[PDB]
């Protein structure tokens, strides 16, 4: 089938237009809108909408955007924090290092802690400058 269409499940002859993001396949096109608390983020021919994700309060996350019908919930961190990705999807909000007894070589970023260097007498352990 061409781009944007799919082979009808019960008939190799027929090409069916895919559902737009924000909708799902009610019937082979009969696309219906995603109900509250679900979504689809790509063109699809999926029988139901995906469940929205939720921000991880235990990781210190905060909601940037609530779930919409075509976009999953988006989560991040607060001022002066960065995201440590434990995995592709799981991340934890940590406080940016202050590089005490040292110097901020590169400032904190979204997904990356402050890069410190240390003054004479100290060295880095757990990205803090220790004696």
């Amino acid at each position: 089938c061409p781009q944007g269409k799919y082979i009808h499940p019960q008939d190799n002859s027929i090409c069916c237009t895919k559902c737009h993001k924000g909708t799902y396949l009610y019937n082979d096109t009969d696309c219906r809108e995603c109900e509250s608390g679900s979504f689809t983020a790509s063109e699809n021919h999926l029988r139901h909408c995906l469940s929205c994700s939720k921000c991880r309060k235990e990781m210190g996350q905060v909601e940037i955007s609530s779930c919409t019908v075509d976009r999953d919930t988006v989560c991040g961190c607060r001022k002066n924090q960065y995201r440590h990705y434990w995995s592709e999807n799981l991340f934890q909000c940590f406080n940016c290092s202050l590089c005490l007894n040292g110097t901020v070589h590169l400032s904190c970023q979204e997904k990356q802690n402050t890069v410190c260097t240390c003054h004479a007498g100290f060295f880095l352990r757990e990205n803090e400058c220790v004696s």
Partner: peptide, 24 residues
């Protein structure tokens, strides 16, 4: 340390990696 384990589906009908089963 956090350890994760995830079984994912990459479906023909929906070309994004999606969790079927997951734990931490």
């Amino acid at each position: 340390v956090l350890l994760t384990h995830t079984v994912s589906r990459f479906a023909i009908s929906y070309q994004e990696k999606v969790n079927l089963l997951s734990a931490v």
